Amino acid sequence: MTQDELYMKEAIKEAKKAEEKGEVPIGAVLVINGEIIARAHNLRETEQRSIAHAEMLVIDEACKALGTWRLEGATLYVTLEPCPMCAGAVVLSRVEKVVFGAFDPKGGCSGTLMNLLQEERFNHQAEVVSGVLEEECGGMLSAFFRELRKKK
Amino acid sequence: LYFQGSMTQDELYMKEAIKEAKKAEEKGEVPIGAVLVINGEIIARAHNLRETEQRSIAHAEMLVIDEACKALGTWRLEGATLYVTLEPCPMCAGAVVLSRVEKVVFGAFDPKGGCSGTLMNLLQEERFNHQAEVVSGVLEEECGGMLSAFFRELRK
Numbered sequence: 566m567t568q569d570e571l572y573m574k575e576a577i578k579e580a581k582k583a584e585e586k587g588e589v590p591i592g593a594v595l596v597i598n599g600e601i602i603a604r605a606h607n608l609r610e611t612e613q614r615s616i617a618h619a620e621m622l623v624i625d626e627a628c629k630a631l632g633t634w635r636l637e638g639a640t641l642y643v644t645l646e647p648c649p650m651c652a653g654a655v656v657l658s659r660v661e662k663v664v665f666g667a668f669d670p671k672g673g674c675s676g677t678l679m680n681l682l683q684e685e686r687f688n689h690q691a692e693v694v695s696g697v698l699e700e701e702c703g704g705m706l707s708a709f710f711r712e713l714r715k716k717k
Numbered sequence: 718l719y720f721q722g723s724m725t726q727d728e729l730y731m732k733e734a735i736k737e738a739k740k741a742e743e744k745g746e747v748p749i750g751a752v753l754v755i756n757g758e759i760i761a762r763a764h765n766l767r768e769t770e771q772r773s774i775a776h777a778e779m780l781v782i783d784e785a786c787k788a789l790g791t792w793r794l795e796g797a798t799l800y801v802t803l804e805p806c807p808m809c810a811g812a813v814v815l816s817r818v819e820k821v822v823f824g825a826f827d828p829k830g831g832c833s834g835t836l837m838n839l840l841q842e843e844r845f846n847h848q849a850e851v852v853s854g855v856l857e858e859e860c861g862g863m864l865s866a867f868f869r870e871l872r873k
Protein backbone atom coordinates (compact mmCIF):
# COMPACT_ATOMS: atom_id res chain seq x y z
CA MET A 566 0.00 0.00 0.00
CA THR A 567 1.21 3.46 -1.05
CA GLN A 568 1.70 6.49 1.19
CA ASP A 569 -1.65 8.06 0.29
CA GLU A 570 -3.46 4.76 0.88
CA LEU A 571 -1.73 4.41 4.26
CA TYR A 572 -3.11 7.77 5.42
CA MET A 573 -6.52 7.10 3.87
CA LYS A 574 -6.65 3.98 6.08
CA GLU A 575 -6.53 6.29 9.12
CA ALA A 576 -9.30 8.45 7.66
CA ILE A 577 -11.22 5.19 7.11
CA LYS A 578 -10.74 4.35 10.80
CA GLU A 579 -12.26 7.75 11.57
CA ALA A 580 -15.17 6.96 9.22
CA LYS A 581 -15.83 3.78 11.24
CA LYS A 582 -15.92 5.74 14.51
CA ALA A 583 -18.73 7.78 12.94
CA GLU A 584 -20.63 4.66 11.88
CA GLU A 585 -20.26 3.44 15.49
CA LYS A 586 -22.22 6.57 16.49
CA GLY A 587 -24.77 6.06 13.70
CA GLU A 588 -23.40 8.88 11.52
CA VAL A 589 -22.74 8.70 7.82
CA PRO A 590 -19.23 7.11 7.86
CA ILE A 591 -17.02 9.90 6.50
CA GLY A 592 -13.58 10.44 8.00
CA ALA A 593 -10.64 12.77 7.62
CA VAL A 594 -7.05 13.27 8.78
CA LEU A 595 -4.79 16.26 8.30
CA VAL A 596 -1.10 15.56 7.70
CA ILE A 597 1.93 17.87 7.77
CA ASN A 598 5.44 16.48 7.19
CA GLY A 599 4.25 12.91 7.72
CA GLU A 600 2.49 13.53 11.07
CA ILE A 601 -1.28 13.33 11.50
CA ILE A 602 -1.86 16.57 13.34
CA ALA A 603 -5.67 16.24 13.42
CA ARG A 604 -8.26 13.56 12.73
CA ALA A 605 -12.04 13.78 12.74
CA HIS A 606 -15.25 12.27 11.44
CA ASN A 607 -18.77 13.36 10.57
CA LEU A 608 -20.73 14.59 13.60
CA ARG A 609 -23.74 16.27 11.94
CA GLU A 610 -26.33 14.23 13.83
CA THR A 611 -24.70 13.61 17.20
CA GLU A 612 -23.96 17.34 17.52
CA GLN A 613 -26.84 18.59 15.29
CA ARG A 614 -24.51 21.04 13.56
CA SER A 615 -24.80 21.39 9.80
CA ILE A 616 -21.13 22.43 9.77
CA ALA A 617 -19.71 19.33 11.53
CA HIS A 618 -18.40 17.66 8.39
CA ALA A 619 -15.22 15.64 8.84
CA GLU A 620 -13.18 18.10 6.75
CA MET A 621 -14.33 21.19 8.71
CA LEU A 622 -13.65 19.57 12.09
CA VAL A 623 -10.15 18.39 11.18
CA ILE A 624 -9.31 21.77 9.65
CA ASP A 625 -10.51 23.68 12.69
CA GLU A 626 -8.68 21.28 15.00
CA ALA A 627 -5.55 21.71 12.88
CA CYS A 628 -5.84 25.50 13.10
CA LYS A 629 -6.41 25.32 16.85
CA ALA A 630 -3.65 22.75 17.46
CA LEU A 631 -1.22 24.88 15.44
CA GLY A 632 -2.30 28.42 16.32
CA THR A 633 -2.67 29.51 12.69
CA TRP A 634 -5.34 29.80 10.03
CA ARG A 635 -2.84 29.02 7.23
CA LEU A 636 -2.25 25.25 7.15
CA GLU A 637 0.56 25.55 4.60
CA GLY A 638 1.96 22.20 3.53
CA ALA A 639 -0.98 20.21 4.88
CA THR A 640 -2.46 17.24 3.05
CA LEU A 641 -6.11 16.53 3.85
CA TYR A 642 -7.15 12.90 3.52
CA VAL A 643 -10.93 12.40 3.51
CA THR A 644 -12.92 9.30 2.59
CA LEU A 645 -15.37 11.25 0.39
CA GLU A 646 -15.13 14.08 -2.13
CA PRO A 647 -15.53 17.39 -0.21
CA CYS A 648 -18.79 19.31 -0.50
CA PRO A 649 -18.59 23.01 -1.47
CA MET A 650 -18.44 24.19 2.17
CA CYS A 651 -15.45 21.95 2.93
CA ALA A 652 -13.79 22.65 -0.41
CA GLY A 653 -14.12 26.33 0.48
CA ALA A 654 -12.48 25.71 3.84
CA VAL A 655 -9.56 23.97 2.10
CA VAL A 656 -9.07 27.03 -0.13
CA LEU A 657 -9.36 29.48 2.77
CA SER A 658 -6.90 27.52 4.94
CA ARG A 659 -4.33 27.15 2.08
CA VAL A 660 -4.24 23.34 2.40
CA GLU A 661 -1.74 22.16 -0.21
CA LYS A 662 -3.30 18.84 -1.23
CA VAL A 663 -6.61 17.04 -0.91
CA VAL A 664 -6.74 13.27 -1.31
CA PHE A 665 -10.17 11.70 -1.30
CA GLY A 666 -11.48 8.18 -1.71
CA ALA A 667 -14.90 8.01 -3.31
CA PHE A 668 -16.42 10.55 -5.66
CA ASP A 669 -19.79 12.07 -4.66
CA PRO A 670 -21.85 12.19 -7.88
CA LYS A 671 -24.68 13.97 -6.04
CA GLY A 672 -22.79 16.72 -4.23
CA GLY A 673 -19.02 16.66 -4.76
CA CYS A 674 -17.25 19.94 -5.56
CA SER A 675 -13.64 18.80 -5.90
CA GLY A 676 -14.10 17.20 -9.33
CA THR A 677 -17.69 16.08 -9.92
CA LEU A 678 -20.26 18.94 -9.93
CA MET A 679 -17.38 21.45 -10.13
CA ASN A 680 -13.87 21.81 -8.67
CA LEU A 681 -13.65 24.55 -6.05
CA LEU A 682 -10.18 23.17 -5.20
CA GLN A 683 -8.81 24.13 -8.65
CA GLU A 684 -10.59 27.44 -9.21
CA GLU A 685 -7.99 29.79 -10.68
CA ARG A 686 -10.07 32.89 -9.83
CA PHE A 687 -9.51 32.08 -6.13
CA ASN A 688 -6.36 33.13 -4.31
CA HIS A 689 -5.36 29.47 -3.73
CA GLN A 690 -5.61 26.08 -5.44
CA ALA A 691 -4.92 22.65 -3.97
CA GLU A 692 -3.54 19.54 -5.61
CA VAL A 693 -6.34 16.97 -5.86
CA VAL A 694 -5.85 13.18 -5.78
CA SER A 695 -8.98 11.07 -6.21
CA GLY A 696 -10.04 7.45 -5.91
CA VAL A 697 -7.58 6.46 -3.21
CA LEU A 698 -9.10 3.25 -1.76
CA GLU A 699 -12.23 4.18 -3.70
CA GLU A 700 -14.01 0.81 -3.39
CA GLU A 701 -13.62 0.66 0.37
CA CYS A 702 -14.55 4.32 0.89
CA GLY A 703 -17.62 4.23 -1.34
CA GLY A 704 -18.77 0.76 -0.31
CA MET A 705 -18.70 1.85 3.34
CA LEU A 706 -21.28 4.54 2.54
CA SER A 707 -23.50 2.15 0.56
CA ALA A 708 -23.51 -0.47 3.33
CA PHE A 709 -24.29 2.16 5.96
CA PHE A 710 -27.44 3.29 4.13
CA ARG A 711 -28.37 -0.27 3.19
CA GLU A 712 -28.11 -1.26 6.86
CA LEU A 713 -30.14 1.84 7.79
CA ARG A 714 -33.19 0.82 5.73
CA LYS A 715 -32.91 -2.68 7.22
CA LYS A 716 -33.72 -1.14 10.60
CA LYS A 717 -37.43 -0.43 10.05
CA LEU B 718 -49.61 62.65 5.42
CA TYR B 719 -46.83 61.65 7.86
CA PHE B 720 -43.67 63.53 8.73
CA GLN B 721 -41.55 60.51 9.70
CA GLY B 722 -40.24 57.68 7.57
CA SER B 723 -38.48 54.37 7.97
CA MET B 724 -35.99 51.83 6.72
CA THR B 725 -37.23 48.54 5.39
CA GLN B 726 -37.08 45.56 7.73
CA ASP B 727 -34.23 44.11 5.65
CA GLU B 728 -32.05 47.20 6.00
CA LEU B 729 -32.78 47.42 9.73
CA TYR B 730 -31.39 43.88 10.10
CA MET B 731 -28.56 44.72 7.72
CA LYS B 732 -27.50 47.61 9.92
CA GLU B 733 -27.11 45.24 12.86
CA ALA B 734 -24.86 43.23 10.54
CA ILE B 735 -23.00 46.49 9.84
CA LYS B 736 -22.63 47.04 13.58
CA GLU B 737 -20.97 43.62 13.83
CA ALA B 738 -18.70 44.49 10.88
CA LYS B 739 -17.61 47.62 12.77
CA LYS B 740 -16.47 45.48 15.71
CA ALA B 741 -14.46 43.43 13.21
CA GLU B 742 -13.05 46.69 11.84
CA GLU B 743 -11.70 47.90 15.19
CA LYS B 744 -10.08 44.50 15.79
CA GLY B 745 -8.20 44.86 12.50
CA GLU B 746 -10.18 42.15 10.66
CA VAL B 747 -11.85 42.29 7.29
CA PRO B 748 -14.98 44.26 8.39
CA ILE B 749 -17.66 41.69 7.57
CA GLY B 750 -20.63 41.30 9.89
CA ALA B 751 -23.62 39.00 9.96
CA VAL B 752 -26.90 38.36 11.75
CA LEU B 753 -29.19 35.34 11.51
CA VAL B 754 -32.92 35.90 11.97
CA ILE B 755 -35.63 33.24 12.44
CA ASN B 756 -39.27 33.76 13.37
CA GLY B 757 -38.73 37.52 13.24
CA GLU B 758 -35.91 37.76 15.78
CA ILE B 759 -32.10 37.84 15.70
CA ILE B 760 -30.80 34.53 17.08
CA ALA B 761 -27.12 35.07 16.33
CA ARG B 762 -24.71 37.79 15.35
CA ALA B 763 -21.03 37.63 14.56
CA HIS B 764 -18.20 39.18 12.62
CA ASN B 765 -15.03 38.01 10.93
CA LEU B 766 -12.51 36.59 13.40
CA ARG B 767 -9.90 34.80 11.27
CA GLU B 768 -6.96 36.77 12.70
CA THR B 769 -8.31 37.07 16.26
CA GLU B 770 -8.95 33.36 16.59
CA GLN B 771 -6.43 32.08 14.00
CA ARG B 772 -9.14 29.84 12.54
CA SER B 773 -9.67 29.83 8.80
CA ILE B 774 -13.40 29.09 9.10
CA ALA B 775 -14.23 31.90 11.56
CA HIS B 776 -16.20 33.84 8.95
CA ALA B 777 -19.20 35.82 10.14
CA GLU B 778 -21.65 33.58 8.26
CA MET B 779 -20.07 30.43 9.69
CA LEU B 780 -20.14 31.76 13.25
CA VAL B 781 -23.80 32.83 13.22
CA ILE B 782 -24.88 29.63 11.44
CA ASP B 783 -23.07 27.43 13.97
CA GLU B 784 -24.41 29.53 16.90
CA ALA B 785 -27.96 29.10 15.54
CA CYS B 786 -27.55 25.36 14.98
CA LYS B 787 -26.23 25.01 18.53
CA ALA B 788 -28.93 27.26 20.02
CA LEU B 789 -31.83 25.65 18.14
CA GLY B 790 -30.58 22.09 18.73
CA THR B 791 -30.85 21.26 15.00
CA TRP B 792 -28.64 21.26 11.91
CA ARG B 793 -31.59 22.45 9.76
CA LEU B 794 -32.20 26.22 10.00
CA GLU B 795 -35.57 26.15 8.26
CA GLY B 796 -37.10 29.56 7.62
CA ALA B 797 -33.90 31.39 8.58
CA THR B 798 -32.69 34.56 6.89
CA LEU B 799 -28.99 35.38 6.89
CA TYR B 800 -27.92 39.06 6.73
CA VAL B 801 -24.26 39.54 5.90
CA THR B 802 -22.59 42.78 4.82
CA LEU B 803 -20.65 41.16 1.97
CA GLU B 804 -21.47 38.49 -0.60
CA PRO B 805 -20.65 35.04 0.86
CA CYS B 806 -17.56 33.10 -0.14
CA PRO B 807 -17.79 29.43 -1.24
CA MET B 808 -17.29 28.09 2.30
CA CYS B 809 -20.19 30.14 3.66
CA ALA B 810 -22.47 29.66 0.67
CA GLY B 811 -21.95 25.93 1.09
CA ALA B 812 -22.80 26.27 4.76
CA VAL B 813 -25.96 28.20 3.85
CA VAL B 814 -26.94 25.37 1.48
CA LEU B 815 -26.22 22.62 4.01
CA SER B 816 -28.27 24.30 6.76
CA ARG B 817 -31.27 25.00 4.49
CA VAL B 818 -31.12 28.72 5.27
CA GLU B 819 -34.16 30.09 3.45
CA LYS B 820 -32.82 33.46 2.34
CA VAL B 821 -29.54 35.35 2.24
CA VAL B 822 -29.58 39.15 2.26
CA PHE B 823 -26.19 40.70 1.56
CA GLY B 824 -24.95 44.23 1.07
CA ALA B 825 -21.93 44.62 -1.18
CA PHE B 826 -20.67 42.31 -3.89
CA ASP B 827 -17.25 40.72 -3.53
CA PRO B 828 -15.65 41.23 -6.98
CA LYS B 829 -12.72 38.94 -6.09
CA GLY B 830 -14.28 36.01 -4.20
CA GLY B 831 -18.06 36.28 -4.11
CA CYS B 832 -19.87 32.98 -4.72
CA SER B 833 -23.45 34.23 -4.38
CA GLY B 834 -23.51 36.09 -7.69
CA THR B 835 -20.07 37.24 -8.84
CA LEU B 836 -17.70 34.36 -9.69
CA MET B 837 -20.55 31.84 -9.40
CA ASN B 838 -23.75 31.41 -7.39
CA LEU B 839 -23.60 28.42 -5.07
CA LEU B 840 -26.88 29.62 -3.51
CA GLN B 841 -28.93 29.01 -6.67
CA GLU B 842 -27.48 25.70 -7.82
CA GLU B 843 -30.12 23.40 -9.31
CA ARG B 844 -27.74 20.47 -8.85
CA PHE B 845 -27.66 21.06 -5.08
CA ASN B 846 -30.33 19.78 -2.72
CA HIS B 847 -31.28 23.31 -1.63
CA GLN B 848 -31.40 26.86 -3.02
CA ALA B 849 -31.55 30.06 -0.99
CA GLU B 850 -33.41 33.17 -2.03
CA VAL B 851 -30.78 35.86 -2.59
CA VAL B 852 -31.23 39.61 -2.13
CA SER B 853 -28.25 41.83 -2.91
CA GLY B 854 -27.44 45.51 -2.52
CA VAL B 855 -29.08 46.18 0.86
CA LEU B 856 -27.21 49.23 2.25
CA GLU B 857 -24.66 48.48 -0.48
CA GLU B 858 -22.70 51.71 -0.16
CA GLU B 859 -22.11 51.48 3.62
CA CYS B 860 -21.17 47.76 3.45
CA GLY B 861 -18.83 48.09 0.47
CA GLY B 862 -17.40 51.32 1.87
CA MET B 863 -15.81 49.57 4.85
CA LEU B 864 -14.27 46.89 2.65
CA SER B 865 -12.86 49.44 0.22
CA ALA B 866 -11.48 51.47 3.13
CA PHE B 867 -9.88 48.33 4.56
CA PHE B 868 -8.28 47.35 1.24
CA ARG B 869 -7.23 50.94 0.42
CA GLU B 870 -5.30 51.19 3.70
CA LEU B 871 -3.79 47.78 2.86
CA ARG B 872 -2.55 49.10 -0.50
CA LYS B 873 -0.94 52.04 1.32
Ligand SMILES: [Zn+2]
Pocket residue numbers: 618619620647648649650651652
Ligand atom coordinates in the same frame (compact mmCIF):
# COMPACT_ATOMS: atom_id res chain seq x y z
ZN1 LIG C 1 -18.41 18.97 3.52
Ligand SMILES: [Zn+2]
Pocket residue numbers: 776778805806807808809810
Ligand atom coordinates in the same frame (compact mmCIF):
# COMPACT_ATOMS: atom_id res chain seq x y z
ZN1 LIG D 1 -16.94 32.93 4.03
